[PDB]
Amino acid sequence: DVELREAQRDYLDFLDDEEDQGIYQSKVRELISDNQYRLIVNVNDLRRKNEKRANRLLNNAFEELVAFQRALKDFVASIDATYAKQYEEFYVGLEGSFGSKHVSPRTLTSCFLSCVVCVEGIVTKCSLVRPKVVRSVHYCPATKKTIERRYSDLTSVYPTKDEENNPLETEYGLSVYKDHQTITIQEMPEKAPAGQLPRSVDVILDDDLVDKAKPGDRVQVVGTYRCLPGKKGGYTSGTFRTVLIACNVKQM
Amino acid sequence: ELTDEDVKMITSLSKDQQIGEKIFASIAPSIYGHEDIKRGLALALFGGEPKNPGGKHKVRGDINVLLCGDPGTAKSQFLKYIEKVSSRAIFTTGQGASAVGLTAYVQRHPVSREWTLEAGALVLADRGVCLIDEFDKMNDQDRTSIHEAMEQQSISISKAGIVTSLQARCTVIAAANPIGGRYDPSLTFSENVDLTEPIISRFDILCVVRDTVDPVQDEMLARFVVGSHVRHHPSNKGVEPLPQEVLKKYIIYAKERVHPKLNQMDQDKVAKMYSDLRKESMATGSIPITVRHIESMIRMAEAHARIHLRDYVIEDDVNMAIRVMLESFIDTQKFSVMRSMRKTFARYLSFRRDNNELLLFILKQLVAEQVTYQRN
Ligand SMILES: Nc1ncnc2c1ncn2[C@@H]1O[C@H](COP(=O)(O)OP(=O)(O)OP(=O)(O)O)[C@@H](O)[C@H]1O
Ligand SMILES: [Mg+2]
């Protein structure tokens, strides 16, 4: 993929901040020193250094964020491979000045799907934190075999019988889970028009963000807006359920 | 009810030159007496002329009526007759015993299961008549809603998400009982009724129905009701009142076509009358006369002209409207002020009141005084 390689190279060059003011090199040193695996990057820096990269990141959030995270992992490996080996993936959060993407749940129209949005709102729902499995390990007493099965982020089959029908006992401890939560955010009553009912939107929080925001707090969520699918079925209505896959949650 | 050649019929008796008495006697024919109340209800039915000079001075063309009286006097009968005879007329009670309430709201209709905006009763009578029985037993919110409707001729809803303002240009005909179940003339009207001053200030006619012991009237009413009972048994199932269907045809035609203009009103007479009433009312510790009384007199004069389809208010129309307005205003006063204003303005209050009526009233007063002296 020439496009993905170019994106990753540009992102890595940006993160390679030694000739410049050394801001993001210091930020990576910070994240490694304090033992966290998520980086916060100001979009204004992307605009100042490469407008094309910033526009691509904002308008096509998913693949651009994947490339940015892979470049981040490569850079942290270069600065330190010992720490980089500890975490399977290095995540990224965004912030700054989102020109037209900065909206509220009311203004959040379908035009922003697959884009980067920095919404501001009042938190209404915070669901219980659940561990979503990402990698299961199953041990067969009969065959002495340990089988690992991955679970890609498709936001399904859980093996229980061996090849010749030997029961598999899942290895919870060796299995890998990521904590996950869903919150519902609402437009601030102050800025909402006085007449009609409040307009809200969902937000999905992965690890490092499951409890960053509590119910009834004014927050700013930066993330990707996409459509959820229905379950398997012959017939479907054109309707789609949309959520905001957060890349960063900040207290206003 | 869109007929033709009945314009000839309506005009045929419109020139009778005494149709006013006929129509005033053709209201609720099942109710004996209460002629003044019937006149007031006729004027309310025909209504005034709504006018909004420029767009900043909204003046209602309606004639709201309030019948306050001790029980057993057929007030609810008048309200039910108006319900029966006037199109777009709805009936509601201060209690919750009415099908539709005074206040707007939104909900899923119990039978249709559909989410609808239940507009208040006043709105349903947008261009008709709203009859309010038990006017003195409403809720706080009901009182607020009636106040809003009577003041600004519209209702503002912000219940669920519906920030709207829908207009209710209704004529309110209300019935009520005095505080304590009996009207005491020694107290002014505004204090022996469980209604705040702003509410009463928006009614154009106040009818004080009093049940005073009188052998002749008692015998007459007994004969009336007992004859009704006789004639409606299951086995057997000074002008001439108009038939009810023709009466409502006349009401429709007048209320839809003729729009009298008061280009012939004698401003001199009205101004002198108003100044005299102001001076007299303030000379005593009594409720004064205000501009809204002149407004109500104008509306009633226009309505009386509409009854006769004159298209131009005439001196007699103005005099009759003044008679009605002064009768209401005087009867709202306390006992002493009642006689004060009666004697001071007897000339105005006697318009179109022949000698026989006044003489009979005076003879009845004298004989009642004699009876009281006898039986004490
Ligand atoms: N002037 C009248 N002419 C004919 N019938 C009358 C008259 N006054 C009272 N009645 C009769 O007497 C009864 C009492 O009248 P009604 O029930 O209408 O009372 P009301 O004035 O509405 O009292 P309340 O304030 O208690 O509701 C009725 O059957 C009514 O027909
Ligand atoms: Mg009654």
XYZ file of C-alpha atoms and ligand atoms in Angstrom:
660
model
C 0.000 0.000 0.000
C 1.817 3.081 -1.281
C -0.660 5.442 0.392
C -0.408 3.758 3.796
C 3.391 3.619 3.572
C 3.503 7.332 2.739
C 1.188 8.123 5.653
C 3.286 6.097 8.090
C 6.518 7.660 6.828
C 5.126 11.182 7.192
C 3.836 10.455 10.698
C 7.152 8.908 11.756
C 9.055 11.893 10.359
C 6.792 14.192 12.371
C 7.367 12.170 15.542
C 11.119 12.285 14.860
C 11.321 15.691 16.559
C 14.979 16.530 17.147
C 15.772 19.131 14.478
C 12.596 20.989 15.497
C 11.654 22.257 18.980
C 11.772 18.669 20.244
C 8.224 18.817 21.599
C 6.891 15.415 20.529
C 10.186 13.636 21.174
C 9.841 14.957 24.722
C 6.206 13.811 24.767
C 7.234 10.275 23.793
C 9.928 10.351 26.478
C 7.163 11.425 28.863
C 4.780 8.624 27.904
C 7.519 6.002 28.190
C 8.905 7.362 31.479
C 5.539 7.488 33.287
C 4.463 4.071 31.916
C 1.502 4.872 29.685
C 0.796 3.629 26.167
C -1.324 6.432 24.677
C -0.011 9.662 23.159
C -1.871 12.963 22.789
C -1.025 14.959 19.658
C -2.174 18.504 18.935
C -3.747 18.720 15.479
C -2.455 22.289 15.169
C 1.045 20.803 14.953
C -0.016 18.627 12.013
C -1.542 21.663 10.302
C 1.613 23.707 10.914
C 3.945 20.991 9.609
C 1.870 19.259 6.901
C -1.593 20.478 5.921
C -2.174 17.494 3.628
C -1.484 15.038 6.450
C -3.749 16.920 8.862
C -6.583 17.073 6.330
C -6.240 13.372 5.513
C -6.214 12.467 9.210
C -9.313 14.547 9.936
C -11.304 13.482 6.858
C -10.339 9.766 6.944
C -9.837 8.932 10.604
C -9.564 5.141 10.732
C -6.721 4.212 8.373
C -4.835 7.438 9.086
C -4.997 6.747 12.827
C -3.842 3.174 12.209
C -0.824 4.474 10.295
C -0.126 7.105 12.957
C -0.266 4.506 15.740
C 2.026 2.130 13.846
C 4.503 4.971 13.312
C 4.238 5.787 17.022
C 5.020 2.182 17.946
C 7.996 2.179 15.578
C 9.302 5.429 17.072
C 8.959 4.209 20.663
C 10.717 0.993 19.647
C 13.545 3.081 18.184
C 13.846 5.174 21.349
C 13.389 2.069 23.526
C 12.556 -1.449 22.348
C 12.261 -2.891 25.867
C 9.228 -0.772 26.758
C 7.846 -0.935 23.212
C 7.760 -4.734 23.470
C 5.612 -4.545 26.617
C 2.508 -3.148 24.892
C 0.977 -4.745 21.806
C -0.357 -1.429 20.473
C 0.337 2.252 21.106
C -2.747 4.461 20.876
C -3.130 8.133 19.966
C -5.336 10.984 21.152
C -5.997 14.238 19.307
C -6.656 17.800 20.443
C -6.290 21.401 19.334
C -8.428 23.518 16.997
C -10.809 21.468 14.835
C -11.974 24.002 12.262
C -15.345 22.641 11.141
C -15.296 19.298 12.978
C -15.660 20.945 16.409
C -19.412 20.534 16.911
C -22.019 19.452 19.454
C -24.314 16.405 19.481
C -26.992 18.576 17.869
C -24.749 19.741 15.018
C -23.333 16.222 14.568
C -24.720 15.324 11.133
C -23.975 12.276 8.996
C -21.588 14.439 6.942
C -18.858 13.779 9.535
C -18.939 9.968 9.347
C -15.436 8.490 9.026
C -13.968 11.862 10.065
C -12.317 13.200 13.214
C -14.681 15.142 15.479
C -13.960 17.074 18.684
C -17.377 17.268 20.336
C -18.178 19.047 23.597
C -21.033 17.834 25.749
C -22.524 16.898 29.086
C -22.099 13.235 30.001
C -25.438 11.511 30.581
C -24.609 7.780 30.609
C -21.541 5.903 31.833
C -22.004 2.153 31.474
C -20.263 -0.448 33.602
C -16.724 -1.230 32.467
C -16.579 -4.638 30.788
C -13.482 -6.610 29.725
C -13.783 -7.299 25.995
C -11.572 -10.232 25.022
C -9.098 -9.646 22.193
C -7.012 -12.826 22.384
C -8.118 -16.119 23.940
C -5.955 -19.065 25.008
C -7.447 -22.544 25.380
C -5.773 -25.591 26.921
C -6.640 -29.196 26.078
C -6.058 -31.623 28.981
C -6.216 -34.609 26.625
C -3.856 -33.375 23.891
C -1.678 -31.116 26.102
C -2.118 -28.463 23.387
C -2.513 -24.735 24.016
C -4.262 -22.895 21.175
C -4.306 -19.109 20.804
C -7.106 -17.393 18.877
C -7.135 -13.698 17.994
C -10.205 -11.444 17.929
C -9.770 -8.488 15.587
C -11.543 -5.224 16.373
C -14.573 -5.587 14.082
C -16.555 -2.804 15.777
C -16.535 -14.165 16.911
C -16.652 -17.934 17.371
C -15.224 -18.912 20.754
C -13.526 -22.324 20.450
C -14.590 -25.001 22.925
C -13.856 -28.358 21.222
C -10.510 -29.517 19.866
C -10.052 -30.826 16.328
C -11.047 -34.372 17.360
C -13.675 -33.133 19.861
C -11.451 -32.857 22.932
C -12.911 -30.288 25.369
C -10.968 -27.029 25.582
C -10.657 -25.222 28.917
C -10.132 -21.502 28.394
C -7.052 -19.991 30.056
C -8.498 -16.830 31.584
C -5.220 -15.669 33.104
C -3.290 -16.035 29.852
C -6.168 -14.584 27.821
C -5.920 -10.893 26.930
C -8.807 -8.500 27.562
C -9.152 -4.757 27.049
C -11.489 -2.820 29.313
C -14.291 -1.175 27.358
C -17.193 1.133 28.131
C -19.991 3.028 26.405
C -21.129 6.495 27.459
C -23.877 8.790 26.214
C -22.994 12.477 25.881
C -25.453 15.343 25.493
C -25.262 18.921 24.266
C -24.795 21.401 27.087
C -28.189 22.790 28.184
C -26.599 26.248 28.180
C -25.927 26.190 24.429
C -28.933 24.078 23.438
C -31.870 26.027 21.970
C -34.386 26.685 24.720
C -37.285 24.973 22.954
C -36.619 21.436 21.759
C -35.425 18.361 23.618
C -31.709 17.671 24.114
C -29.773 15.919 21.366
C -27.185 13.318 22.355
C -24.702 10.857 20.869
C -22.948 7.665 21.911
C -19.234 7.285 22.613
C -17.207 4.071 22.847
C -14.152 4.103 25.124
C -11.384 1.501 24.954
C -8.541 1.071 27.448
C -6.912 4.182 28.965
C -10.288 5.951 28.654
C -12.902 3.660 30.236
C -13.402 5.913 33.277
C -11.824 9.191 32.136
C -15.282 10.805 32.337
C -17.933 10.331 35.020
C -21.698 10.878 34.724
C -22.856 14.470 34.878
C -19.579 16.134 33.892
C -18.864 18.585 31.076
C -16.371 16.870 28.768
C -14.692 17.150 25.378
C -14.458 13.924 23.367
C -12.199 13.711 20.310
C -12.723 10.639 18.179
C -13.949 9.010 14.998
C -17.610 9.006 13.954
C -18.708 5.831 12.156
C -21.731 3.604 11.554
C -22.490 0.400 13.422
C -23.934 -2.626 11.595
C -26.878 -4.789 12.495
C -26.620 -8.480 13.209
C -26.595 -11.097 10.465
C -29.841 -11.016 8.513
C -31.252 -11.388 5.024
C -33.115 -8.075 5.212
C -31.909 -4.697 6.443
C -33.274 -1.180 6.678
C -31.130 1.623 5.300
C -30.937 2.909 8.875
C -27.529 2.776 10.552
C -26.552 3.293 14.188
C -23.706 5.774 14.618
C -21.264 6.175 17.509
C -18.145 8.216 18.258
C -15.168 5.897 18.741
C -13.214 8.114 21.110
C -9.492 8.645 20.681
C -9.319 11.084 23.617
C -11.565 12.219 26.472
C -10.758 15.405 28.383
C -12.447 17.202 31.257
C -13.562 20.648 30.111
C -76.029 24.625 6.652
C -75.179 26.463 3.423
C -78.613 27.308 2.065
C -79.872 30.003 -0.301
C -83.039 32.100 -0.486
C -83.007 31.992 3.314
C -81.231 35.343 3.104
C -84.679 36.571 2.073
C -86.193 34.857 5.120
C -83.652 36.394 7.500
C -84.094 39.807 5.885
C -87.870 39.293 5.770
C -88.170 39.421 9.567
C -85.049 41.577 9.968
C -87.211 44.592 9.069
C -89.860 43.639 11.646
C -88.742 46.703 13.690
C -89.165 44.663 16.921
C -86.906 41.698 16.119
C -84.681 42.605 19.058
C -87.418 41.709 21.528
C -88.227 38.539 19.580
C -84.643 37.272 19.663
C -84.126 38.301 23.292
C -87.249 36.280 24.127
C -86.132 33.383 21.893
C -83.135 32.327 24.030
C -83.474 29.213 26.182
C -87.285 29.036 25.893
C -87.262 26.410 28.669
C -86.117 29.050 31.201
C -88.742 31.386 32.644
C -87.861 35.011 33.261
C -84.256 36.177 33.505
C -84.922 38.444 30.534
C -81.830 40.585 31.129
C -79.622 37.486 31.195
C -81.197 36.365 27.919
C -80.480 39.781 26.397
C -76.864 39.589 27.523
C -76.500 36.101 26.074
C -78.002 37.268 22.771
C -75.478 40.102 22.595
C -72.701 37.625 23.396
C -73.932 35.268 20.665
C -73.958 37.930 17.961
C -70.641 39.286 19.233
C -68.868 42.556 18.503
C -66.286 43.492 15.888
C -62.619 42.603 16.533
C -60.293 45.374 15.424
C -56.525 45.821 15.700
C -55.629 49.405 14.720
C -52.323 49.166 12.920
C -51.032 45.913 14.340
C -50.155 46.959 17.879
C -53.522 47.492 19.653
C -55.423 44.192 19.740
C -59.036 44.796 20.799
C -61.244 41.728 21.072
C -64.621 41.712 19.371
C -66.023 39.198 21.845
C -68.493 39.845 24.666
C -67.581 37.596 27.590
C -70.390 37.037 30.089
C -70.290 35.916 33.724
C -73.470 34.732 35.459
C -72.869 34.761 39.216
C -75.853 33.669 41.267
C -77.145 31.650 44.170
C -77.992 28.054 43.208
C -81.303 26.870 41.827
C -81.610 29.644 39.235
C -80.951 27.824 35.925
C -77.505 29.256 35.163
C -76.295 25.877 33.920
C -79.502 25.747 31.876
C -78.465 28.944 30.085
C -74.981 27.559 29.477
C -76.394 24.300 28.105
C -78.792 26.174 25.821
C -75.880 28.179 24.427
C -74.021 24.897 23.943
C -77.019 23.589 22.006
C -77.774 26.624 19.838
C -74.331 27.959 18.827
C -71.995 26.245 16.382
C -68.397 25.687 17.492
C -69.620 25.859 21.101
C -67.982 23.673 23.742
C -68.893 23.041 27.377
C -66.484 22.514 30.272
C -66.714 22.622 34.053
C -64.391 23.949 36.726
C -64.319 20.428 38.125
C -62.697 17.630 36.144
C -66.123 16.253 35.217
C -65.815 17.737 31.703
C -64.616 15.817 28.664
C -62.003 18.438 27.710
C -59.955 20.550 30.106
C -59.111 24.237 29.965
C -55.336 23.731 29.767
C -53.326 22.446 26.823
C -50.961 19.474 27.032
C -49.488 16.638 24.960
C -50.035 12.915 25.473
C -50.963 9.647 23.787
C -54.726 9.667 23.321
C -56.178 6.800 25.401
C -58.323 5.330 22.619
C -56.218 6.121 19.537
C -52.923 5.337 21.343
C -51.376 8.124 19.226
C -49.234 10.973 20.555
C -51.256 14.155 20.036
C -51.249 17.756 21.242
C -54.420 18.046 23.312
C -55.147 21.750 22.920
C -57.065 23.356 25.747
C -60.822 23.696 25.538
C -60.502 27.432 24.887
C -58.481 26.671 21.749
C -61.096 24.224 20.460
C -63.578 27.115 20.601
C -61.166 29.175 18.516
C -63.933 31.218 16.853
C -66.935 30.043 18.879
C -68.190 29.927 22.468
C -66.574 28.361 25.532
C -69.030 27.669 28.349
C -67.378 27.347 31.760
C -69.555 26.028 34.573
C -68.284 26.153 38.156
C -66.080 29.083 37.176
C -65.143 29.567 40.857
C -63.839 26.002 41.389
C -60.944 25.900 38.921
C -57.345 24.890 39.568
C -54.424 27.296 39.751
C -53.308 26.229 36.275
C -56.881 26.439 34.980
C -57.123 29.981 36.351
C -53.830 30.891 34.682
C -54.989 29.419 31.368
C -58.327 31.237 31.399
C -56.494 34.447 32.294
C -54.114 33.991 29.361
C -56.932 33.217 26.924
C -59.064 36.159 28.047
C -56.136 38.597 28.052
C -54.046 37.819 24.965
C -56.535 35.688 22.973
C -53.997 32.886 22.576
C -52.244 30.039 24.375
C -48.504 29.403 24.594
C -47.329 25.799 24.964
C -43.827 24.644 25.916
C -44.699 21.294 27.479
C -42.550 18.605 25.829
C -40.690 20.243 22.952
C -43.549 22.163 21.349
C -42.616 25.830 21.772
C -45.707 27.187 20.038
C -48.358 29.890 20.385
C -51.790 28.990 18.992
C -54.636 31.476 19.176
C -57.978 30.919 20.933
C -60.373 33.759 20.073
C -63.256 32.422 22.142
C -66.178 34.104 23.871
C -66.265 32.900 27.476
C -69.692 32.441 29.046
C -69.160 31.446 32.668
C -71.449 30.403 35.510
C -70.593 30.633 39.198
C -72.019 30.723 42.716
C -71.217 33.409 45.308
C -68.901 32.710 48.218
C -70.899 30.971 50.923
C -73.581 29.776 48.509
C -75.603 33.001 48.712
C -75.157 36.423 47.132
C -75.249 39.244 49.683
C -75.979 42.659 48.103
C -74.438 44.427 51.104
C -71.058 43.353 49.669
C -69.691 44.406 46.297
C -69.608 41.819 43.529
C -65.825 41.433 43.386
C -65.624 40.314 47.036
C -68.492 37.787 47.292
C -67.071 35.683 44.442
C -64.020 33.406 44.597
C -62.369 35.161 41.659
C -59.480 37.606 41.609
C -60.008 41.099 40.246
C -58.024 40.565 36.996
C -60.279 37.675 35.957
C -63.511 39.582 36.573
C -62.056 42.655 34.859
C -62.076 40.810 31.507
C -65.825 40.035 31.462
C -68.013 42.495 29.577
C -71.318 41.591 31.283
C -71.872 40.561 34.911
C -75.298 39.038 35.590
C -76.088 38.851 39.311
C -78.801 36.199 39.545
C -80.508 36.405 42.942
C -83.125 34.002 44.305
C -85.353 36.281 46.386
C -88.563 34.932 47.895
C -91.523 36.228 45.877
C -94.911 34.452 45.982
C -96.046 35.471 42.490
C -92.787 34.542 40.765
C -92.541 31.359 42.835
C -96.032 30.304 41.742
C -95.279 31.142 38.112
C -92.041 29.137 38.094
C -93.732 26.222 39.856
C -96.424 26.200 37.179
C -93.751 26.344 34.473
C -91.662 23.432 35.735
C -94.623 21.264 36.750
C -96.175 21.767 33.321
C -92.863 20.758 31.767
C -92.870 17.589 33.872
C -96.457 16.865 32.817
C -95.777 17.439 29.122
C -92.590 15.332 29.047
C -94.088 12.260 30.716
C -93.074 9.070 28.851
C -96.664 8.262 27.855
C -97.267 11.709 26.329
C -93.953 11.746 24.432
C -94.944 39.980 24.463
C -93.782 38.643 21.099
C -93.532 35.199 19.516
C -90.084 33.562 19.827
C -88.357 32.638 16.591
C -87.885 28.910 15.925
C -84.481 27.754 17.115
C -83.291 26.588 13.692
C -84.210 29.933 12.130
C -82.630 31.693 15.112
C -79.308 29.967 14.466
C -79.599 30.644 10.729
C -80.061 34.324 11.597
C -77.076 34.161 13.948
C -74.917 32.613 11.227
C -75.884 35.195 8.612
C -75.462 38.188 10.927
C -72.204 36.925 12.448
C -70.753 36.213 8.988
C -71.978 39.094 6.787
C -72.980 42.321 8.563
C -70.095 44.223 10.183
C -71.501 47.415 11.728
C -69.297 50.506 11.812
C -69.777 53.154 14.501
C -69.564 56.263 12.343
C -72.785 57.667 13.854
C -71.972 57.393 17.566
C -72.529 60.628 19.498
C -69.096 61.163 21.026
C -70.484 64.079 23.040
C -73.074 61.959 24.842
C -70.662 59.098 25.522
C -67.928 61.407 26.819
C -70.289 63.302 29.119
C -71.759 60.021 30.367
C -68.309 58.589 31.096
C -67.154 61.728 32.908
C -70.319 61.806 35.015
C -69.927 58.132 35.910
C -66.284 58.653 36.872
C -67.178 61.587 39.115
C -70.061 59.732 40.759
C -68.180 56.476 41.330
C -65.184 58.285 42.833
C -67.502 60.474 44.921
C -68.248 57.258 46.836
C -66.022 54.471 48.092
C -67.080 52.314 45.152
C -65.452 50.439 42.292
C -64.867 53.113 39.615
C -65.658 53.171 35.920
C -62.718 52.684 33.561
C -61.996 52.790 29.838
C -62.671 49.074 29.409
C -66.287 49.838 30.309
C -66.475 52.196 27.331
C -64.874 49.456 25.242
C -67.525 46.979 26.393
C -70.295 49.475 25.656
C -68.891 49.911 22.142
C -68.770 46.144 21.622
C -72.334 45.685 22.873
C -73.602 48.523 20.678
C -71.947 46.887 17.671
C -73.488 43.539 18.629
C -76.959 45.057 18.998
C -76.548 46.681 15.587
C -75.506 43.275 14.241
C -78.734 41.766 15.582
C -80.655 44.243 13.414
C -78.084 43.999 10.581
C -78.058 47.799 10.394
C -74.399 47.940 9.237
C -74.235 51.305 11.061
C -74.645 51.636 14.819
C -77.634 53.892 15.477
C -78.407 56.094 18.468
C -80.852 53.537 19.870
C -78.211 50.799 19.642
C -75.786 52.967 21.613
C -78.454 53.760 24.202
C -79.333 50.076 24.635
C -75.661 49.139 25.000
C -75.277 51.877 27.610
C -78.351 50.526 29.393
C -76.892 47.023 29.588
C -73.407 48.163 30.610
C -74.746 50.474 33.318
C -77.076 47.763 34.610
C -74.144 45.379 35.008
C -71.841 48.003 36.528
C -74.513 49.162 38.988
C -75.459 45.632 40.034
C -71.777 44.939 40.711
C -71.812 47.693 43.353
C -72.789 47.338 46.998
C -76.301 47.939 48.298
C -76.067 51.656 49.090
C -74.102 52.488 45.941
C -76.696 50.472 44.028
C -79.440 52.951 44.911
C -77.028 55.878 44.608
C -76.219 55.072 40.982
C -79.786 53.967 40.218
C -81.201 57.352 41.209
C -78.254 59.282 39.774
C -78.468 57.567 36.357
C -82.097 56.390 36.296
C -82.504 58.160 32.947
C -79.850 56.009 31.266
C -81.041 52.803 32.946
C -84.661 53.387 31.839
C -84.010 53.457 28.081
C -86.503 51.257 26.200
C -88.019 50.360 29.600
C -91.707 51.198 29.303
C -93.695 52.663 32.182
C -95.450 49.395 33.046
C -92.206 47.617 33.953
C -90.987 50.364 36.301
C -94.426 50.753 37.883
C -94.710 47.002 38.470
C -91.225 46.936 39.998
C -92.082 49.797 42.359
C -95.406 48.230 43.359
C -93.646 44.924 44.030
C -91.068 46.723 46.175
C -93.801 48.455 48.184
C -95.821 45.274 48.706
C -92.669 43.361 49.689
C -91.896 46.062 52.253
C -95.447 45.686 53.565
C -95.047 41.896 53.737
C -91.781 42.177 55.663
C -93.371 44.627 58.097
C -96.303 42.231 58.526
C -94.340 39.048 59.177
C -91.567 40.435 61.413
N -86.099 30.281 35.671
C -86.270 28.959 35.551
N -87.067 28.500 34.563
C -87.239 27.182 34.436
N -86.715 26.195 35.167
C -85.934 26.675 36.139
C -85.661 28.009 36.396
N -84.809 28.137 37.480
C -84.588 26.899 37.849
N -85.235 25.962 37.085
C -85.182 24.511 37.253
O -84.774 24.232 38.581
C -83.733 23.233 38.599
C -82.461 23.843 39.144
O -81.751 24.533 38.095
P -80.266 24.144 37.727
O -80.058 22.651 38.020
O -79.908 24.534 36.349
O -79.400 24.958 38.768
P -78.169 25.965 38.703
O -78.588 27.371 38.599
O -77.262 25.480 37.579
O -77.425 25.662 40.066
P -75.949 25.402 40.618
O -75.206 26.687 40.750
O -76.160 24.659 41.942
O -75.330 24.438 39.607
C -83.660 22.666 37.181
O -84.460 21.496 37.054
C -84.196 23.810 36.312
O -84.861 23.346 35.142
Mg -74.857 25.136 37.895
